[PDB]
């Protein structure tokens, strides 16, 4: 939020603040594989709250590229992402929720064991979804099924504990 | 409950190795174990180099580290590199 905006204007923001006429790709000043994800990834997740142009564009594109190319750099940082995820979701803004759920789907397929590691944090991040359970209702179901799919044997029941109405036939 | 699976020994000194050195001197595998054990906002680092500046140990004493490289080429081999 304010944290991300400060980040955005600093020389150490790793993305070049420029637009190419060819398309909407972001240009990295610094190679992604060279970033300490312990520092940078939570800063980008702070941007989930962002709804203002151009902050939200760089937050979203940045998260996406770092998740896509993070490899084994992502899982070690998972605990640091939970509070920014929770904070975004608990705003109870549908647009922010829809971006955050798509991000979460990317997160749990981004690397091995990440879906499994998310399970102990279900109770921190799922509760607001009950308000918007059934468009956002379908996105929620879809997201919960991703969590189950890549979350190991203990995933269904922990989803169900937090989201009592959850059902699934994978 | 996030913990590495495989372990290798470092080959050539690098920035990454320097920092692993500093964590392990203080009794931590890496920044992930450090943040598990202690409640950490950010890690104190040297602005110019990004090197770890200070760490709190498990007995609550503190280790401080120099602005420039500390890992002697001799010591490089002893730095453990953890998997995931
Ligand atoms: Cl994404």
Q: Give me the residue spans of the domains in chain A.
A: 1-170
Contact A117 B1 (CB under 8 A): yes
Q: How many residues does chain A have?
A: 170
Residue with tokens 């180099």: B49
**Residue B58 three-state SS:** coil
| Contact (CB, 8 A) for A156 and A148 | yes
Q: Is B84 on the interface with A (CB under 8 A)?
A: yes
**Residue in chain A lying closest to B1 (CA):** A117
Check if the beta carbon of residue A162 is closer than 8 Å to that of residue A127. yes
How remote is the CA of residue B48 from the centroid of ligand 1, in Å? 31
Give the span between the Cα atoms of B77 and A150, in whole angstroms.
37
User: Among candidates A77, A74, A102, which has minimal Cα distance to A88?
Assistant: A102
Please confirm whether the linkage preceding B44 is cis (ω < 30° from 0): no
Distance CA A98, CA A108 (A): 16
Residues of chain B with Cβ-Cβ distance to A75 below 8 Å are 2, 84
Measure in Å the smallest separation between the Cα of B22 and chain A Cα atoms. Answer: 15
Q: What distance in Å separates the CA atoms of residue A32 and residue A18, rounded to the nearest whole number?
A: 17
CA distance B60 to A115: 34
Contacts of B50 in chain A (CB under 8 A): 36
Number of neighbours of residue B61 by Cβ within 10 angstroms = 9
Closest C-alpha among A25, A29, A23 to residue A10: A29
Collapsed DSSP state (helix, strand, coil) of residue A33: helix
A80 vs A75: CA distance, rounded Å: 10
Pick the closest to residue A43 from A19, A86, A14 (CA basis): A14
CB of B64 less than 8 A from some CB of A: no
Q: Match 């896509």 to its residue by tokens.
A: A68
**C-alpha dihedral (B30, B33, B38, B44), degrees to nearest 10:** 20
How determined?
X-ray
List the alpha helices (DSSP H) in A37-77: 37-45, 55-69
Say yes or no: B7 contacts chain A, CB-CB below 8 A: no
- Cα–Cα distance measured from residue A142 to residue B36, given in angstroms and rounded to the nearest whole number: 31
CB distance from B47 to chain A under 8 Å?
no
Q: Which residues, other chains included, contact A99 with Cβ-Cβ below 8 Å and sequence gap of 6+?
A: A48, A56, A60
Cα–Cα distance measured from residue B66 to residue B49, given in angstroms and rounded to the nearest whole number: 10
How many CA atoms lie less than 13 Å away from A156 in the CB half-sphere? 6
C-alpha distances out from residue A7 to A1, A25, A66, A102, B44, Å: 10, 20, 16, 23, 17
- Residues with CB in 5 Å of ion ligand 1: A 63-64, 103, 106
User: CB under 8 Å to B9, separation ≥6 — which residues?
Assistant: B77, B78, B79, B80, B81
Which 3 state secondary structure label does DSSP give B9? Answer: strand
Separation between Cα atoms, residue A74 and residue B49, nearest integer Å: 23
Question: How crowded is residue B62: how many other Cβ atoms within 10 Å of its Cβ?
Answer: 10
Inter-chain contact B35–A38, Cβ cutoff 8 Å? yes
CA A92/CA A131 separation, integer angstroms: 9
Residue of A31, A36, A114 to mutate when probing chain B, most B C-beta within 10 A: A36
Residue B79 near residue B21, CB atoms below 8 Å:
yes
Cβ pair A76:B36 closer than 8 A = no
- What does B20-52 look like in DSSP terms, one character per residue? HHHHHHTT-SSHHHHHHHS--S---B-TTT--B
A38 and B31 within 8 Å at the Cβ level: the answer is yes
């Amino acid at each position: 939020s304010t944290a991300f905006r400060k980040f955005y204007e600093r020389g150490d923001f790793p993305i070049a603040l420029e637009h190419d006429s060819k398309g909407n790709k972001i240009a990295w000043k610094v190679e992604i594989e060279k970033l300490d994800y312990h520092h940078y990834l939570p800063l980008f997740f702070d941007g989930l709250c962002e709804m203002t142009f151009p902050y939200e564009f760089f937050a979203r594109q940045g998260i996406h590229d770092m998740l896509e190319h993070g490899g084994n750099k992502i899982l070690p940082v998972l605990p640091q992402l939970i509070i920014p995820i929770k904070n975004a979701l608990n705003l109870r803004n549908r647009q922010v929720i829809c971006v955050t759920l798509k991000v979460l789907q990317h997160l749990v397929v981004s690397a091995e064991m990440v879906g499994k590691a998310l399970v102990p944090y279900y109770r921190q991040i799922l509760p607001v979804l009950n308000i918007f359970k059934n468009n956002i209702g379908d996105l929620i179901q879809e997201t919960l099924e991703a969590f189950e799919r890549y979350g190991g044997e203990n995933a269904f029941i922990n989803i169900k504990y937090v989201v009592p109405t959850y059902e699934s036939c994978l | 409950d996030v913990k590495p699976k495989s372990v290798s020994h470092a080959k050539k000194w690098s920035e990454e190795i320097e920092n692993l050195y500093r964590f392990q001197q203080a009794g931590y595998r890496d920044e992930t174990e450090y943040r598990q054990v202690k409640q950490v906002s950010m890690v104190d680092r040297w602005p110019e180099t990004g090197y770890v500046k200070k760490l709190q140990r498990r007995d609550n004493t503190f280790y401080y580290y120099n602005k420039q490289r500390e890992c002697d080429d001799k010591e490089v081999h002893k730095v453990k590199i953890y998997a995931y």
